[PDB]
Design an enzyme around this catalytic site. Structure first.
Site, short mmCIF file in Angstrom:
data_model
loop_
_atom_site.label_atom_id
_atom_site.label_comp_id
_atom_site.label_asym_id
_atom_site.label_seq_id
_atom_site.Cartn_x
_atom_site.Cartn_y
_atom_site.Cartn_z
N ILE A 66 0.88 -1.21 0.00
CA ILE A 66 0.00 0.00 0.00
C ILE A 66 0.90 1.24 0.00
O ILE A 66 1.97 1.19 0.63
CB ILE A 66 -0.98 -0.03 1.19
CG1 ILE A 66 -2.03 1.07 1.08
CG2 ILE A 66 -0.24 0.03 2.52
CD1 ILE A 66 -3.18 0.89 2.04
N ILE A 77 0.67 5.85 -0.57
CA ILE A 77 0.05 7.18 -0.85
C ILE A 77 1.18 8.11 -1.30
O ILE A 77 2.24 8.11 -0.63
CB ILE A 77 -0.66 7.74 0.39
CG1 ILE A 77 -1.65 6.74 1.01
CG2 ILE A 77 -1.33 9.07 0.07
CD1 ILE A 77 -2.87 6.45 0.15
N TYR A 81 -6.45 9.97 3.36
CA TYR A 81 -6.51 9.04 2.20
C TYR A 81 -5.94 7.67 2.60
O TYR A 81 -6.46 6.64 2.11
CB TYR A 81 -5.75 9.63 1.00
CG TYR A 81 -6.38 10.87 0.41
CD1 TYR A 81 -7.63 10.81 -0.19
CD2 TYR A 81 -5.73 12.09 0.46
CE1 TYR A 81 -8.21 11.95 -0.74
CE2 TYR A 81 -6.30 13.23 -0.08
CZ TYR A 81 -7.55 13.16 -0.68
OH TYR A 81 -8.11 14.27 -1.23
N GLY A 82 -4.91 7.66 3.45
CA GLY A 82 -4.27 6.43 3.94
C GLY A 82 -5.25 5.57 4.71
O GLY A 82 -5.39 4.38 4.37
N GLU A 108 0.36 -8.14 4.15
CA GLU A 108 1.61 -8.93 3.99
C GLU A 108 2.73 -8.23 4.77
O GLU A 108 2.88 -7.01 4.62
CB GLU A 108 1.94 -9.03 2.49
CG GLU A 108 3.21 -9.81 2.18
CD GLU A 108 3.47 -10.02 0.70
OE1 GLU A 108 2.71 -9.49 -0.14
OE2 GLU A 108 4.45 -10.72 0.38
C1 LIG Z 1 4.46 6.16 0.95
N1 LIG Z 1 3.76 5.04 1.60
C2 LIG Z 1 4.30 3.69 1.38
C3 LIG Z 1 2.71 5.26 2.41
C4 LIG Z 1 2.08 4.21 3.08
C5 LIG Z 1 0.99 4.45 3.93
C6 LIG Z 1 0.52 5.74 4.12
C7 LIG Z 1 -0.47 6.24 4.86
C8 LIG Z 1 -0.49 7.56 4.68
C9 LIG Z 1 -1.46 8.57 5.31
O1 LIG Z 1 -1.46 9.75 4.93
N2 LIG Z 1 -2.29 8.09 6.24
S1 LIG Z 1 -3.36 9.09 6.97
O2 LIG Z 1 -4.50 9.36 6.04
O3 LIG Z 1 -2.67 10.39 7.27
C10 LIG Z 1 -3.95 8.35 8.45
C11 LIG Z 1 -3.63 7.01 8.66
C12 LIG Z 1 -4.05 6.34 9.81
C13 LIG Z 1 -4.79 7.01 10.77
C14 LIG Z 1 -5.12 8.35 10.57
C15 LIG Z 1 -4.70 9.04 9.43
C16 LIG Z 1 -5.09 10.39 9.31
C17 LIG Z 1 -6.45 10.71 9.28
C18 LIG Z 1 -6.87 12.03 9.17
C19 LIG Z 1 -5.92 13.05 9.09
C20 LIG Z 1 -4.56 12.75 9.13
C21 LIG Z 1 -4.15 11.42 9.24
O4 LIG Z 1 0.50 7.94 3.81
C22 LIG Z 1 1.15 6.80 3.45
C23 LIG Z 1 2.23 6.57 2.61
#
Ligand SMILES: CN(C)c1ccc2cc(C(=O)NS(=O)(=O)c3ccccc3-c3ccccc3)oc2c1
Ligand SMILES: CN(C)c1ccc2cc(C(=O)NS(=O)(=O)c3ccccc3-c3ccccc3)oc2c1
Ligand SMILES: [Zn+2]
Ligand SMILES: [Zn+2]
Lengths: 258, 265
Positions: free
Chosen positions: A139, A141, A150-151, A172
Site C-alpha cells: 500500500i 500514498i 486518504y491512507g 503482507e
Molecule cells: C508512501 N507510503 C508507502 C505510504 C504508506 C501508507 C501511508 C499512509 C499515509 C497517510 O497519509 N495516512 S493518513 O491518512 O494520514 C492516516 C492514517 C491512519 C490514521 C489516521 C490518518 C489520518 C487521518 C486524518 C488526518 C490525518 C491522518 O500515507 C502513506 C504513505
C-alpha cells in the site's frame, strides 16, 4: 532517479526503482499522470500528453462518492499499466514483492477527481488468491496527499472487501514505517469506536485475531479478556465529533460482487 | 419500450431490446447519456445525474479534431457500459449478434463535444480477432444525427483501422437498409476520388484494395454497378471528373483526418 515530474507536481523520490538501464542512469524521469508511461525529456512528455487519451486508470470504477473514486485494475488485462504502477510505487517503498509478474494480482487505484481528470492519490495491490489470507500486498500514498485521511480511507476500503467476501484478512509483512503507524492508528480508532456502540469482533470488523490482540496490549485493555477503559473510549468519540474525518468510506457507494 | 429520454432528446424507438422484464413492460425508459444506465422514473434519473461524474465514455480517446472524438472501449475492461450500449443499440437495429458476452469485442463510440460534455452520436462494434476478417460487426447512428455525414465518417474510420493494421476488411453480413445504402455510396465515392489522384497510371484491384482497405469482393461488385469492369478497371473519365466537381463546391463537412488518430494496432 532523484526526482520525477508527475503531472503538475515535481516529486523528490524516497528510494531507487528498477527502471530499465537507459532510464536508471538519468537524474530525472518524466511520467504521464494517467497511463504512467516513463520518458527522458520534458518536450517528449509535452508531446505524449497532446496525443494520450486517458484521464483515469484503464479499469472499472467500483466506488465514487464526493470527488473520490476507486478503480479495480487486473494485472492480466492492463498488464503494462500495472507494471508501470509497480515501478512508480517502489520510489516510495522500502521494498515490494514483485514488479513484472503482475498477472495474478489486482490493483485498487484511489483517485481525487476534478475537471482535468481522475488524478492518482495512491493504491494497494492484492493477490487474487492468497494462501496466507493477505488482503493487502503493498500500500502507498504519494507524498503530496499524505497526512490528510486518504491512507486510513484505503486501509478501511481493503477491510470492506475482506468483510464482503466473508474472510478476516491482514497486510503482507513486513510493513513500511508510515504503513505500521497508519495500521496501528486504524486498529485503535476502529476497536474503540466499535466498543462505544475477540472472534465476534474480528467477524464484525474483518481484522485478523492476531492484529486485534496486539492492539489491546498496546492500549492496556488485556487481562490474562478485554478491560473496558471508558475515559479512553469516551474521549475518542469526542475527538471525532469536533472536527470529523472528511474522507470516509461509505459502504452504500461500493458497486462490487466478490 | 416505445420512447426513451437520452439527455436533452426524447427519442422514439424503432425496435424492441431485451431490457429485463420489469423494464421491458414500461412505456418509457430513462437513460444516463454518459454511463448508459437505464432507470424507471424521471426523479430517479435526476438523482443519478447528481452523483454520476462522467461526461464521456469510460475509455481511451484515440481521435479528436474539431468537436468530434472517438473513444476505444474494451468489453473486457468496461463490461457493464458495453452491455448497456448493446441494449441501447438494438432499439435502432433490425438484429445484432450478442448483448452480454462483450469481453471479446471492441466498441468505437463517436461523440460530438460541447461545454456540457461528449454526447453520444453512434458506434460500431468489432471482434478483437475475426477469422472471417470482419472490421465491423454492427454500426448505428442515433436518429437526431442521421443524414449529416456522421455515418460516412464512422465507415471511413473503420477502414482506416483496417489499413493501419495492414488487412483488408468487410462489415459482418447481412447489412441493414441504411447500412447497405451508406456502404455502397461510400465504396463509389472512395473508388472514384482514389482514381482521380492516379492521373492516368493504370491500377490493379489487389493494389486498389491495399490503398483503400476494402475487401476485393466489395470492390469488384461496386465496379460492376458503375460499368467499369472488363474480364480489370475501365476508367470512365466523365464520371471521375464530375464527382471531383461535386466535392469542390459543397465540401464534406465532417471528415476523418488521418493525422489526428493516436492509435497503434
Ligand atoms: C508512501 N507510503 C508507502 C505510504 C504508506 C501508507 C501511508 C499512509 C499515509 C497517510 O497519509 N495516512 S493518513 O491518512 O494520514 C492516516 C492514517 C491512519 C490514521 C489516521 C490518518 C489520518 C487521518 C486524518 C488526518 C490525518 C491522518 O500515507 C502513506 C504513505
Ligand atoms: C440506425 N443505423 C443502424 C444506422 C446505420 C447507418 C447509418 C448511416 C447513417 C448516416 O446518416 N449516414 S450519412 O453519410 O450521414 C447519410 C445517410 C443518408 C443520406 C445522406 C447522408 C449523408 C452523407 C454525407 C453527408 C451528409 C449526409 O445513419 C445511419 C444509421
Ligand atoms: Zn499517457
Ligand atoms: Zn451515469
Amino acid at each position: 532517479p532523484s526526482v520525477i515530474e508527475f503531472g503538475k507536481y515535481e516529486i523528490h523520490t524516497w528510494y531507487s526503482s528498477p527502471y530499465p538501464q537507459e532510464y536508471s542512469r538519468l537524474p530525472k524521469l518524466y511520467l504521464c499522470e494517467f497511463c504512467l508511461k516513463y520518458m527522458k525529456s520534458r518536450t517528449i512528455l509535452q508531446q505524449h500528453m497532446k496525443k494520450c487519451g486517458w484521464f483515469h486508470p484503464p479499469a472499472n470504477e467500483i466506488y465514487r462518492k464526493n470527488n473520490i473514486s476507486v478503480f479495480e485494475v487486473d494485472g492480466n488485462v492492463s498488464t503494462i499499466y500495472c507494471q508501470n504502477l509497480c515501478l512508480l510505487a517502489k520510489l516510495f517503498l522500502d521494498h515490494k514483492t514483485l514488479y513484472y509478474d503482475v498477472e495474478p494480482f489486482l490493483f485498487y487505484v484511489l483517485t481525487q477527481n476534478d475537471v482535468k481528470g481522475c488524478h492518482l492519490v495512491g493504491y494497494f495491490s492484492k493477490e487474487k488468491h492468497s494462501q496466507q489470507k493477505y488482503n493487502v500486498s503493498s500500500i502507498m500514498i504519494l507524498p503530496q496527499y499524505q497526512r490528510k485521511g486518504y491512507g486510513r480511507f484505503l486501509i478501511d476500503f481493503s477491510y470492506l472487501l475482506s468483510k464482503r467476501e466473508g474472510q478476516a484478512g491482514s497486510p503482507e509483512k513486513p510493513l513500511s514505517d508510515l504503513g505500521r503507524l497508519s495500521y496501528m492508528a486504524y486498529w485503535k480508532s476502529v476497536i474503540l469506536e466499535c466498543l462505544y456502540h475477540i472472534k465476534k469482533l474480528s467477524k464484525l470488523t474483518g481484522i485478523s485475531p492476531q492484529d486485534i490482540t496486539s492492539t489491546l496490549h498496546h492500549l492496556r485493555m488485556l487481562d490474562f479478556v478485554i478491560i473496558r477503559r471508558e475515559k479512553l473510549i469516551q474521549d475518542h468519540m469526542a475527538k471525532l465529533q469536533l472536527n470529523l474525518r472528511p474522507v470516509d468510506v461509505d459502504p452504500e457507494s461500493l458497486r462490487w460482487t466478490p
